[PDB]
Structure formats: structure tokens, C-alpha cells
Design a protein around this ligand. Structure first.
Ligand SMILES: COc1ccc(C(OCCN2CCC[C@H](C(=O)O)C2)(c2ccc(OC)cc2)c2ccc(OC)cc2)cc1
Ligand SMILES: [Cl-]
Lengths: 538, 215, 213
């Protein structure tokens, strides 16, 4: 079925197989799901339905849609542009690490499965050469599993501080260059989709996730990992970090407030069903996130079983959990290098598809907003090459010895936290109060046939902005510092630059409001009347 | 519970104009879209217009577009449909349907205002009593000849008799209508009980009762 | 203009009998947009089946729509006297909206002979200068009954009225009315007035004569 194959080619992504178990292990195991399902019900469905319906209604790019829906709140589009720029900066480095893992995979013995190399320290131990072994005192002397040592001391060569930026890793730089040039190849030759290439590269991630889950439940001692994954702690619910990270994991995995969802709506015709597609896409995305959570948490439960250390601190808990638990899982398969290279090629495919659609949405929005310059002299591909070069040069600051902290900062403060919360708040205020939810419900009735069931309407008015503003204020007043491996206590200038770019991602809305008020002034009531009123027939 | 009562309609000249009004109650009129459905005298149903729940998404059929406008008023919970240049082809009995969810259909309908377009003139009905023959079940008749337009409400003995009554649909010739009705009565009932026939024509306000003897 | 047609336009169903209507669509229509209605004889239509599978509130479960694509059908298990009406099919897929042609659900039963009753015109009828003699045919089945007027020594064709009653909800029969329109000058020029109709109960038509005397 063409409908089943194309939809399944969009449910999976790196935000479900890499970011969700990272956020579910850093911010408490079982306590992450309680604000996960709340935002899933109250902010995933309504805002996903809102952005898809607005994109299909206006049927154009992601920032001029907000121009013709509400010219006052046109700054919501530019914030999504800045979020897209930050994502395209840091969503390609994950593919660089997966390429580096793919480069080292083609060997009869896996690099992350032995306790002897140039990077393995004295406190290493095999954890496989003997059953009872000689641990429980080596663990007191900080015993470390070989994959946990391999990732740090060879993949990125971690340093003891963000102020300790070491030499740039040239192998990772060539990996990033390969990732950017294959993304540019996908831009030029590869837009012509369908054929025999979609029946293979869409069902492949589900087969691999199924076999990885089947292995993960077969791993001994995974009951402890699943219990840690499911049983919640209320003391781990008392902090705002869990709520913020769960809400913005909902917003990130669904591409909510990123900016490409308005472009997704414009691709469909005027009479496509928003409600059924939104419901089934969101439910299947949450389901595959839940399945990947099962797989990784069972694997690290087995890791904590085979070590003497408990579950809470057995992996990195930074954004390399999918690069630590999953390569640990593939070591136990028969014919391990084949499964490892198939896994890493899966990661390349499902990261490259999302990076492709992100950069394509960004470039088509920036050439729709600049129509007379980039559509007359055959320079759209030149702009794509320039954007790729610029994002490759700005992205290289993370590839150093100490750039992992910079990557963690931009991951938690660019397409996450206050940026996504602010954009969702202002989006829902715009639709529910400025454009009018009755008018938008009438537009949805004219589009798909039936109005929203008024639960989504009341979510647009009072539920979603209320809960997101509550989470915003709760994070603001009770500030908690961010720690990389759950204990780092970042320097103040790192928090300063993270908050600076998080502001610059979200201060574009009131700045655009201010310059729109100043540019066309007819005193306050005429200004608000002429800015509230939409443009043309939409 | 929900009453989609309708007003307006009647005899109009060809090329004139009419303003049908549909009044809604028992529900939120601003939350459900509205449509007008007409029924031809050949009992053929077709859709005329549709306005959305707000009042800016307006659709028409290809037979009434350009001449027909549809309005709305969410304050007094009323609906409108104004037409211009009425010909002899768009005579019907217009319904006030209610359809908001396109997967649900026109769930609640109205009553139906009879609309007649003709070059004829209104004529008062001439109720003609009928004398039976001079059996067991003696029957009585009361025909109405020469009225216009449809419809005319007719009962027997001012609505007190409703069992065994058979009325007939109107028929058009020479721009006049003809209607008849017959009842079945027992031998003891007639002519012991004075049976009369009443007529109700709204277009002429005629109310005349006729009772007949076996002449 | 998604031209929907329904066959047959006229049908007759005995009680407790299988029946299946159809609604052929011109172009393709969605499976969840085609509806079915029911209009009683002398009442507003009500929603009966929506999205070709479901039933409206108050509709009995013996109704069941079917079909998808372009061929759609309405199936009733055991009909009774309470659902003798006309059914239309609608679509909201394409604009402008179209309805079905309408299938009339009729009932059959053992044939009943007509009760022919001739009514001579009253004394006031000749005041206007015309002649209007009327014959009433009541409680007869089926509707395909021909009537002729007999005057002097021949039959009459000009000035014959016709009026067919719809299906009765009491005994499921028709009622036929015929009126002869003439002038009072022609009334005094004639003395034979007979109306007859050939029913299917008797090959010889039932007759009823009268004289102006
Ligand atoms: C299989 O590779 C893909 C996975 C998802 C998408 C969609 O977003 C991508 C934006 N984002 C980036 C951070 C990581 C998120 C993740 O990894 O999930 C995804 C997408 C965006 C725009 C489109 O039109 C141009 C079409 C699809 C996506 C988003 C939500 C969704 O609903 C469940 C389905 C698809 C596209 C390809
Ligand atoms: Cl997710």
C-alpha cells in the first residue's frame, strides 16, 4: 500500500531512537513518562493538528503562512527559522558520529568489545571473560565497560571541561564533510522519490527495531531495566527539568514548532483529512518512541546487571546513550559486525531523511520570502551549497575534544526548552484568541468536512497555553542547573551563551511585533485592528 | 427538541423576487452550517445553497448560481435565502436542512415552504357540494373546482371527521386547480347526521362550509 | 455535478421480504461521504443512513447500507407497514451537491375491487353554466387502472380529469378520481352518463350508470 509505506517512512526518526531514551534516562527513568503522556494528550495532538491544518489551509511556506493568517504574529515563523538553523547545525553531527561508528565497524572484531587498545585505561575490564570475574572492588575503583570507554576516549576524546577545548578531531571533521556532501547529493539527485527504493528503505527501521527489542527483552536482568523505565518517582517529578524535557521531547519528536510542519501541510491538497492523519501519526510516533525506550532501557538494565553498579549511573546519560546501549546490544548478536553496520546504516538513513526535509523546508521558505532574487538567476543550488558550507563551518566547533559540552548545550537550549515552549505558547495564543478558534474551526470544517471536537478547541484556548505557560514559569522561578553526566556544574559563561541563543531563538516574536507596530502606525486601536485582520482569502 | 421552522414563500410573479426565512431553535445556530434543499413538483430533490457556520464560506449549485443569495444571522438564530429573476423552472417546496459534519449529512430538516411561480392570478376556491345517488355504505363528496395556488387544506366537519376520508392531489390545467374528497359513512349515520365539508385556502382567506341534502 | 442515479425508480415489496436498492455514481465518491435519506409521502425527508454503513438516531437496525467506490446499496431485512416511503442518496464529496433519483417503496396485497360511486352535479353547479359530473373510485389495487366516460351512445375522451391517491397507511390501497368537465348546454343535450373502469379482479369492467331524469 502506498499510503502505509509513505506514512511509515515518516514515523521513525532520530528523535525517537536517540533523543527520547536519552531524556528518559537523564531526567529519571520512570518519572519521565508521567509528563510525557500529559503533553502527548494536551499539546501533541492540538498543536500538531493546528500546524498541519494551517499549513494545508494557507498552502504555502512556513513563514508567509503566518503573514497571511495574522500579520501581527508573523514572528512565529522567524523563530521557527532560527530553530531550523540551529537544528541543521546540530542534527548533522549525530550522522557524523554514526559514520565514524560505521567506518570502524568493518572489522572481524568490534572496537567497542575489547579491553585492549590505545584508549582503554587501567580501570577497564572485559565484563565478559568470566562470570563472577573479579569486580565489586574494581567497581569501587571505577570499573568501566569497554563500550563506555570506547565512546568517550576514541569517538570524541572527551575533556575535563568546556573551557578545555582541545585539538579538533580531523577524522570526525571528514565524517561531517561526508555527511554534508551526501546531504547535498540528496538535495540535487534524490528528490525524485518512489520506485523500488521506498519499499526497502522504509520498512527497514521497523524490522531492525523489532529485532533489537526482541534481543533486548532476551537480555538477562532486563526486568530491572524495564522496572526502572516504568516505575516512577514523585521526588523525580518535583523538579522542572523533567516537565520541560518531556514537553519539548513531545515538541521535538513531532516536529512541532520546528517549522517544517507548515510546509508539510502545504504539500497536501485542500481536502485532505488533517484529523485522522494527525491522530495516527502522533500515536504511532509515541508508540515507536515507547518501543525504543523499552529496547535501550532493557539493554542498560542488562549492563547494570552484569556490572555491580546500579541502573541509575551505568551509562553516560548525556546524548550518547543510543551510541552506548545500542552498540552494546549488537555485540551479543551472532555475526555482530553485520548487525552493527546494518544498525549504523539505518541511523544514517533515518537521520539523513530528517536533515533533508529540514534543510529543504528552510531553503524553500527563505526563497519564498525572497522570491525575486533566488528564482531568476539559477542560484538556489548555490544558496544550498553556501548554507551547507556555513553550517559545516559553524558545526565544526562541536567536533573538538571539549565540544561535546557545546553540543549538549545547543541540544538542550536550541530545539528544546524555552524556545519550543515560547513558540508553542504564542502559536496557540494566536490561533485561539487572535485569529479566533471559531473561524479556524470553520476553516477546518470547510477543509476536511467536520469541525474539531471542541476538546482540541478548548486545548487551543486554555489547556495548552495554560500548561505550557505553567511549565515555563515553573522552570523560570525554580531554576536548576544543567549537568552533562548528571554531575558537571557548567561554567556561568556556558549557561550565559546557552540562554543567549535560546533568547535569540525566541525574542524574534516581540521584536517583530515592535517593528511591525513602529513601521505602520495609525495609533494603537487602528494599529491592532489592521494587524489582527488577516490578508486576502488565505 | 429542535425545530427548524420556516417562513416565507408563496405565489410570486415570473422574474420577481422572494425572501425565504428559516428560523432555528433548540441548539446553537452559530455552530452548525446550513443548507437549502428544494423538491420539485415531480418529487425530484436537489441542493440549492450552503452557508458555513460563520457566514463567509458560501456554495451554490450550477442551476441557481448568480441569481440566488444566502444570508445568515447568528444573533436571532435565523436563516435567509433571497432570489432574483424567478422563472417557471425553479418552482419547488424549499426545505431548510442542517448539515455541519460532512460525514453526518443533513440530519435535521425543516417543514417546507411551498413556492409557486406562474403568470396566473389568484382565484377564490369554489366549493361544490355533491349529492349521492337515490346502498349500505352511503358515501358523500365535496370537490373544490377553480382555485390557485397549491396548497389547500381540506377536512370534513371542521376536522372532527378523519377516518375513512380520501383526498386527492391537485391537478393543473388552464392555470386552474381541481381538488376532490370522499368519505365513507354507514346507513344510520347519513342523512341522520348533518355532515359538512370545510375548506381552508390561505391565499384568499376563504372559509366556507357546505352541507348537502339528498336531492 | 456527480450525477447519481437509482434503479428501479418504482418498486413493490411484500412484508417480510428481501430488498436492495442501488445508487450508481457518475464519478468516484468517497466511502464516508455518501448518505441515504427517507421521505414519507407528505413529510420532510429525514436522515436514514450516513457514510453508507451507519444509522441515524431512531432508525431500526434492520436497515444496513453497503458498497464502496461508486456502487452503493441499501439493504432491508423485513419491511413492514411503517417504512413505505421514498429513499434518496446524497454525496458531499464533489460540489455541486446532487441527490438520487428516488426509489418508491410500495406494498402489495390481495387485490380489492374498486367501489365505484357516481356523483351527479348539484343544483348550484349549473348556475355558472357548466357541467361537472364526477365518479369516485375508492379502495382499489393496483394503480394501473384505466377509466372512460360513456355518454349517449359512445365513449368520451375530451375533458377527463385524473387524480391518483398515494399509498394509504391504513389498508394499503389507492383511490382514483375522475371528473367530466362540460357545459350546461351540453348537459341538457345528453341523458346517458356512465363511468366504468377495467379492474384486474373481473375481466368485465365494473359499471355504474345514472340518468339526469
Ligand atoms: C524518516 O525521516 C523523517 C522523519 C520525520 C520527518 C518529519 O519531520 C522532520 C523534522 N524533525 C527533526 C528532528 C527529529 C524529528 C524526528 O526524528 O521525528 C523530526 C517531516 C517534516 C516535514 C515534512 O514535510 C516537508 C514531512 C515530514 C515528520 C514530523 C512529524 C511527523 O509526525 C509523526 C512525521 C514526520 C521527516 C523525515
Ligand atoms: Cl517521541
Amino acid at each position: 500500500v502506498e499510503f502505509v509505506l509513505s506514512v511509515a517512512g515518516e514515523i521513525i526518526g532520530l528523535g525517537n531512537v536517540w533523543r527520547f531514551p536519552y531524556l528518559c534516562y537523564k531526567n529519571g527513568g520512570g518519572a519521565f513518562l508521567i509528563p510525557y503522556v500529559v503533553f502527548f494528550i494536551c499539546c501533541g495532538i492540538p498543536v500538531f493538528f493546528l500546524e498541519t491544518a494551517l499549513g494545508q489551509f494557507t498552502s504555502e511556506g512556513g513563514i508567509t503562512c503566518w503573514r497571511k493568517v495574522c500579520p501581527l504574529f508573523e514572528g512565529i515563523g522567524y523563530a521557527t527559522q532560527v530553530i531550523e538553523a540551529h537544528l541543521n547545525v546540530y542534527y548533522i553531527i549525530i550522522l557524523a558520529w554514526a559514520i565514524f561508528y560505521l567506518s570502524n565497524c568493518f572489522t572481524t572484531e568490534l572496537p567497542w568489545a575489547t579491553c585492549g587498545h590505545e584508549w582503554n585505561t587501567e580501570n577497564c575490564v572485559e565484563f565478559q571473560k568470566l562470570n563472577v570475574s573479579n569486580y565489586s572492588h574494581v567497581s569501587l575503583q571505577n570499573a568501566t565497560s569497554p563500550v563506555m570507554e570506547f565512546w568517550e576516549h576514541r569517538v570524541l576524546a572527551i575533556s575535563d571541561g568546556i573551557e578545555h577545548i582541545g585539538n579538533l578531531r580531523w577524522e570526525l571533521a571528514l565524517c561531517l564533510l561526508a555527511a554534508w556532501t551526501i546531504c547535498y547529493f540528496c538535495i540535487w539527485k534524490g528528490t525524485k522519490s518512489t520506485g523500488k527504493v521506498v519499499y526497502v528503505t522504509a520498512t527497514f527501521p521497523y524490522i531492525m527495531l523489532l529485532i533489537l527489542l526482541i534481543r533486548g527483552v532476551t537480555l538477562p536482568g532486563a526486568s530491572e531495566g524495564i522496572k526502572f523505565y516504568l516505575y516512577p518517582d514523585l521526588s523525580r517529578l518535583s523538579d522542572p527539568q523533567v516537565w520541560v524535557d518531556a514537553g519539548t521531547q513531545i515538541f521535538f519528536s513531532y516536529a512541532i514548532c520546528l517549522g517544517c510542519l507548515t510546509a508539510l501541510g502545504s504539500y497536501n491538497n485542500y481536502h485532505n483529512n488533517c484529523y485522522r492523519d494527525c491522530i495516527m501519526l502522533c500515536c504511532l510516533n509515541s508508540g515507536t518512541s515507547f518501543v525504543a525506550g523499552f529496547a535501550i532501557f532493557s539493554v542498560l538494565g542488562f549492563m547494570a546487571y552484569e556490572q555491580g553498579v546500579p541502573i541509575a549511573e551505568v551509562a553516560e546519560s548525556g546524548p550518547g546513550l543510543a551510541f552506548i546501549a545500542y552498540p552494546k546490544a549488537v555485540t551479543m548478536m551472532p555475526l555482530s559486525p553485520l548487525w552493527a553496520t546494518l544498525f549504523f546504516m539505518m541511523l544514517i538513513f533515518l537521520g539523513l531523511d530528517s536533515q533533508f526535509v529540514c534543510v529543504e523546508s528552510l531553503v524553500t521558505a527563505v526563497v519564498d520570502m525572497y522570491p525575486k532574487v533566488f528564482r531568476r538567476g539559477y542560484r538556489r543550488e548555490l544558496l544550498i551549497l553556501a548554507l551547507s558550507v556555513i553550517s559545516y563551518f559553524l558545526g565544526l566547533v562541536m567536533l573538538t575534544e571539549g565540544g561535546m559540552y557545546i553540543f549538549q548545550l545547543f541540544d538542550s537550549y536550541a530545539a528544546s526548552g524555552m524556545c519550543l515552549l515560547f513558540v508553542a505558547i504564542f502559536e496557540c495564543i494566536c490561533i485561539g484568541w487572535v485569529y479566533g478558534s471559531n473561524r479556524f474551526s470553520e476553516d477546518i470544517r470547510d477543509m476536511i468536512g467536520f469541525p474539531p471536537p471542541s476538546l482540541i478547541k478548548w486545548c487551543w484556548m486554555i489547556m495548552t497555553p495554560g500548561i505550557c505557560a505553567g511549565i515555563f514559569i515553573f522552570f523560570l522561578i525554580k531554576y536548576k542547573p544543567l549537568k552533562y553526566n548528571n554531575i558537571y556544574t557548567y561554567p556561568a559563561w556556558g549557561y550565559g551563551i546557552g540562554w543567549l541563543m535560546a533568547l535569540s531563538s525566541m525574542l524574534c516574536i516581540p521584536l517583530w511585533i515592535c517593528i511591525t507596530v513602529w513601521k505602520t502606525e495609525g495609533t494603537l486601536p487602528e494599529k491592532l485592528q489592521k494587524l489582527t485582520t488577516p490578508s486576502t482569502d488565505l | 427538541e429542535v425545530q427548524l421552522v420556516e417562513s416565507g414563500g408563496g405565489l410570486v410573479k415570473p422574474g420577481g423576487s422572494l425572501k425565504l426565512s428559516c428560523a432555528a431553535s433548540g441548539f446553537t445556530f452559530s455552530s452548525y452550517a446550513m443548507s437549502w434543499v428544494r423538491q420539485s413538483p415531480e418529487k425530484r430533490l436537489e441542493w440549492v445553497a450552503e452557508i458555513s457556520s460563520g457566514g463567509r464560506y458560501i456554495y451554490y449549485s450550477d442551476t441557481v448560481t448568480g441569481r440566488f443569495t444566502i444570508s445568515r444571522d447568528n444573533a436571532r438564530n435565523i436563516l435567509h435565502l433571497e432570489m432574483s429573476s424567478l422563472r417557471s423552472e425553479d418552482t419547488a417546496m424549499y426545505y431548510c436542512a442542517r448539515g455541519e459534519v460532512r460525514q453526518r449529512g443533513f440530519d435535521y430538516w425543516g417543514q417546507g415552504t411551498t413556492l409557486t411561480v406562474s403568470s396566473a392570478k389568484t382565484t377564490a376556491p369554489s366549493v361544490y357540494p355533491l349529492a349521492p345517488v337515490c346502498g349500505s355504505s352511503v358515501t358523500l363528496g365535496c370537490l373544490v373546482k377553480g382555485y390557485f395556488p397549491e396548497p389547500v387544506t381540506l377536512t370534513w366537519n371542521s376536522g372532527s371527521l378523519s377516518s375513512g376520508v380520501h383526498t386527492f392531489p391537485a391537478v393543473l390545467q388552464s392555470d386552474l386547480y381541481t381538488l376532490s374528497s370522499s368519505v365513507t359513512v354507514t346507513s344510520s349515520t347519513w342523512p341522520s347526521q348533518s355532515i359538512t365539508c370545510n375548506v381552508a385556502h390561505p391565499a384568499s382567506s376563504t372559509k366556507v362550509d357546505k352541507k348537502i341534502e339528498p336531492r | 455535478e456527480n450525477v447519481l442515479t437509482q434503479s428501479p425508480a418504482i418498486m413493490s415489496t411484500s412484508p417480510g421480504e428481501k430488498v436492495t436498492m442501488t445508487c450508481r455514481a457518475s464519478s468516484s465518491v468517497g466511502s464516508s461521504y455518501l448518505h441515504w435519506y427517507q421521505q414519507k409521502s407528505g413529510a420532510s425527508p429525514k436522515l436514514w443512513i450516513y457514510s453508507t454503513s451507519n444509522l441515524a438516531s431512531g432508525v431500526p437496525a434492520r436497515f444496513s447500507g453497503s458498497g464502496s467506490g461508486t456502487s452503493y446499496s441499501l439493504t432491508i431485512s423485513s419491511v413492514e407497514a411503517e417504512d413505505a416511503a421514498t429513499y434518496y442518496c446524497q454525496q458531499f464529496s464533489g460540489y455541486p451537491l446532487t441527490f438520487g433519483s428516488g426509489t418508491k417503496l410500495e406494498m402489495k396485497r390481495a387485490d380489492a375491487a374498486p367501489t365505484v360511486s357516481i356523483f351527479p352535479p348539484s343544483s348550484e353547479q349549473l348556475t355558472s353554466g357548466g357541467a361537472s359530473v364526477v365518479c369516485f373510485l375508492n379502495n382499489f389495487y393496483p394503480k394501473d387502472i384505466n377509466v372512460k366516460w360513456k355518454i349517449d351512445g359512445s365513449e368520451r375522451q375530451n375533458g377527463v380529469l385524473n387524480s391518483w391517491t398515494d399509498q394509504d397507511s391504513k389498508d394499503s390501497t389507492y383511490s382514483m378520481s375522475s371528473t367530466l368537465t362540460l357545459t350546461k348546454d351540453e348537459y341538457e343535450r345528453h341523458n346517458s352518463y356512465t363511468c366504468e373502469a377495467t379492474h384486474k379482479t373481473s375481466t368485465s369492467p365494473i359499471v355504474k350508470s345514472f340518468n339526469r331524469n
